[PDB]
Design a protein around this nucleic acid. Sequence first.
DNA 1: AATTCCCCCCCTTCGGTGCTTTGCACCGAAGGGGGGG
Lengths: 542, 396
Amino acid sequence: PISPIETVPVKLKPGMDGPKVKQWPLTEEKIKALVEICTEMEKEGKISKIGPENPYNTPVFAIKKKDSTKWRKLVDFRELNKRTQDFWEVQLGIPHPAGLKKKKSVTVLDVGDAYFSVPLDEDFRKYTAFTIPSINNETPGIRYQYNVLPQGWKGSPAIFQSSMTKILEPFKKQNPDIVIYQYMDDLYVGSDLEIGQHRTKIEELRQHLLRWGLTTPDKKHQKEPPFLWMGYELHPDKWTVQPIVLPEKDSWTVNDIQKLVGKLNWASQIYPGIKVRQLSKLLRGTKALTEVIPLTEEAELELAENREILKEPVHGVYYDPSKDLIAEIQKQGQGQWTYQIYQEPFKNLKTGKYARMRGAHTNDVKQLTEAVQKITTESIVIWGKTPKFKLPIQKETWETWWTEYWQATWIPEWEFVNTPPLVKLWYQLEKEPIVGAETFYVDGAANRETKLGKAGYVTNKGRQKVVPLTNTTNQKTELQAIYLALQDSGLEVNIVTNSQYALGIIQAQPDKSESELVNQIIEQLIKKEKVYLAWVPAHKGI
Amino acid sequence: ETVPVKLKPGMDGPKVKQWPLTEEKIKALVEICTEMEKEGKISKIGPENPYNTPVFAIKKKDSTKWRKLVDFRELNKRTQDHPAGLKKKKSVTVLDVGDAYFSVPLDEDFRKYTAFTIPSINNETPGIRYQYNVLPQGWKGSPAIFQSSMTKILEPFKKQNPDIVIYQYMDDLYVGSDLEIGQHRTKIEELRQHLLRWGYELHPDKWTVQPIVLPEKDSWTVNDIQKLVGKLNWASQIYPGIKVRQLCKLLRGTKALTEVIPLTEEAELELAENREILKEPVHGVYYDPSKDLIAEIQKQGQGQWTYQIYQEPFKNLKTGKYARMRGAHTNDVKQLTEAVQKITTESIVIWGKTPKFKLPIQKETWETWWTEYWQATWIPEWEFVNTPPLVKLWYQ
DNA sequence: AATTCCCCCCCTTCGGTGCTTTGCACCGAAGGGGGGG
Ligand SMILES: Nc1ncnc2c1ncn2[C@H]1C[C@H](O)[C@@H](COP(=O)(O)CP(=O)(O)OP(=O)(O)O)O1
Ligand SMILES: [Mg+2]
Ligand SMILES: [Mg+2]
């Protein structure tokens, strides 16, 4: 039926009118399916026939549901969506099974014909006018307007989510011990009651929903485990993802690589060690989605590793609020990190990765801090509390970094775990000049017309060099001058630069850069035993 | 009574996403908002309202009670529009008078602009939306609609005690006296009682400017002279008159950084003259009420932070230090939050305007952890600096 | 050339902003995938 719920008042944007978009030609199978759907909808009062008094139209079409025997009628409301008032979305995220607590009795319910059970604002119905084109043209089209929430309109999801919340509020208030996860029309219902009492409560909930015009057909009412909920299979003690199929293709295109990367990112929520950086690097530079991309050796090795990971059967566990959350982080190399959130050893609540590359130049400590922040925010989302971190960084290393860093940085309660590779800073800059070491005064110049530049240095002992550079900028010439200074020195060196770009990068202790001049300097700085770098105001007589 | 509030011309309204919250914060928000809706202060709304401002909860110092706070900075910016003796008082107590605010109904054409969303743990349910029916805590037009009632609960004390200077900013009453503390702390109790029937001590004088200081040493090396020349050249932008033209002559030619350079008589003279120039205060800076205040913070290590409040570059209205000797809270984020709150409080005391902060922190770390240590009812505008300072030893 | 909507995530690209070393670094929005209904 249709909900007796109050309609949400909806208006158009100021100064705008309703859509007047013509119906595009439609496949005769699609036309017949739409005709039958519209006949049933009009018999049920969900759509209403309209005549010449309505000057609006919007194209309709149909797709195939997961039922593959029923059709989903959709309306291309893009013009109406652009001319519709703005909404605020109430769905702020996706529920996760790792955030679920253990329940003795579980029932999954799907509300049937969800959108079409919620009435639409009467003043807005005229803008939802559509036309079902006749089979083989000839006859004029049957023109309808929506009396309920249409699929394709940008206001339908939020309105349905508010209506479902309002409908569920009385039952939840009168049954506070029952847990109800509400995602659109999908309802997970968990309780600690006996199976008979739980089924009685489920029948009570179904009766409450039917009074508001929401049906809960037995076809999609799950009573026994495993429960298919939100893309997961829920068992009484463990949860798993629904089977994730990785293509076994021998020729890969850009779109196929994107699909595989997305599927591996999805699988990384429970499967440990999933890496996608090598495959994702194949997407840079490319253009057409149909362009075949030859898989490199590194990409093939990551794909084989991910496949080897995904053949074993893994499962998550349900949250235990009495025990403590522990997130352990591991370095995967090349800026990739894995992490496992668990409360008991070898029983993961959830798994994940962090591989975002922020900044042109960075080190492992900064990336570990970023990963810790990401895991912290994800844990606050899922369980509402920050976990205890097991980080592969020594307390001395973190102390040195955060005391000697010019930014405010922090990591929540964490303990060091001795699992290599360990996070460490690969070089340190001397706080004072080194006595007995050659002092290099370096500089880099570049006129911004011809893009030609000079990198030079002189030492206190008389040595000098003046390498010329092509297609470089002032910044790049200063970095080059520092590079010469590092190359042409012993294990201990004092370098005086008149560049704050250079000193600003080199002082942040980079260990990896999206530049080969900074990356080359990094290898020279790791070899030297002591390096003092000093800025001196430039043209001053120094 | 209802004041016809309006927005600035050609401005839509706040549309800001709600950040994730902890279980304790969400539970506190749910309880507070259930009580507020039961009392009619806030009303449940749907998604047809397109506006939204962030909301969270704090626990004030020595209170053990949760307080709901709403980030109204965007609404304050979009809303269509000082006791100078306050900086010279000895004890300024801050009182929260935001509770009297929830009794004046807000204009119905403006309630939609005060929408906020409570999130759910694990996204079990869709976020619960509310709008304010009364004057909200955090909005800049709320104190502008209580002025009348305030300047009437105040008059019977603001005249009985003409010496005490009372200022009001947002939800806070800064009441500053020159009495002995035992006395100022009794008057304040009397004022509390006089606000109870009608419905944090600062010491603004123990506040000092941090001057620019040059190193004092027996022997000066080439590195020392290069650092001194750099510092003096940077300070020449702030204090014109700094010669540094003969101290740049001892650094002539290529020399080792550890080589000791004897300071010539002219160099010593110029150094003494520059020290005298740096010691005397900078003249020619005036607070322009039309312009906005900018506060820059630099981390100095060992729990030391420097800050400069200015309206134009190199024309500093204030310089200071927040020295929280890193002890138990060796949290950089906690120290930075505590420094930001202190600087905002002194900016409101001195000029009446909160400054725009240039935070020496990554944005994501701040958005993650700043609510865990915030204890003020206001929130200043802040931008995040992602560039080493180096001009960080030029302030400490 | 098949055409829809909303939500979360990751990964890549581009234009805008800020500072002033005018290039470079950084951040948000938008494009593609994944998952949910
Ligand atoms: N591709 C899509 N485009 C637009 N809207 C879409 C959508 N998939 C799901 N939705 C929205 C509308 C459905 O009413 C609602 C429920 O999603 P649903 O896919 O379970 C179908 P429903 O209409 O409830 O009926 P029934 O088949 O169970 O009898 O989710
Ligand atoms: Mg469904
Ligand atoms: Mg359904």
